[PDB]
Amino acid sequence: FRHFSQAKMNPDLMMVETDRDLRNPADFLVIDKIAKALKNVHGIAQVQTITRPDGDPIEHSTIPYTIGQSGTTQIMNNDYMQTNLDNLLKQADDLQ
């Protein structure tokens, strides 16, 4: 108790048992939904499971993260495109 909180010394355990394999993204979506539902209960601090290994959401796992990283590849290719444009100008001079 000098370092942790009291609740971490007496945690609870819940198991959800199905009949089919759950190691695919489609079932991971439902697992995350269940984890959020459990966390939203009044009086619960945090829930850790496969989608929240350390109790916090996995980084780089939101849809807006995927959206916000969509344009980095175009930024990476910029130099090689600028070189092509300069080559176009020099080719025009050669034509002259």
């Binding site: 009291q6 959800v16 199905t18 619960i44 499971t49 959401p57 980084e59 780089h60 796992s61 807006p64």
Partner: protein, 49 residues
């Protein structure tokens, strides 16, 4: 946008690509939270106070 959603610890949406299921970190994690045949998953719950 990506940095903001990471810093805020937002959890409105979630998605894990199939390629992440082959990394060693998630290979170890699925042996820590899921049954050997993958039919069950366990949750750890911590109260307040």
């Amino acid at each position: 946008m990506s940095q903001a959603f990471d810093a805020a610890k937002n959890d409105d949406s979630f998605y894990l690509p199939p390629e992440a299921f082959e990394t060693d970190d998630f290979q170890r994690g699925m042996k820590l939270f899921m049954s050997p045949d993958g039919h069950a998953v366990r949750f750890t719950i911590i109260h307040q106070g």
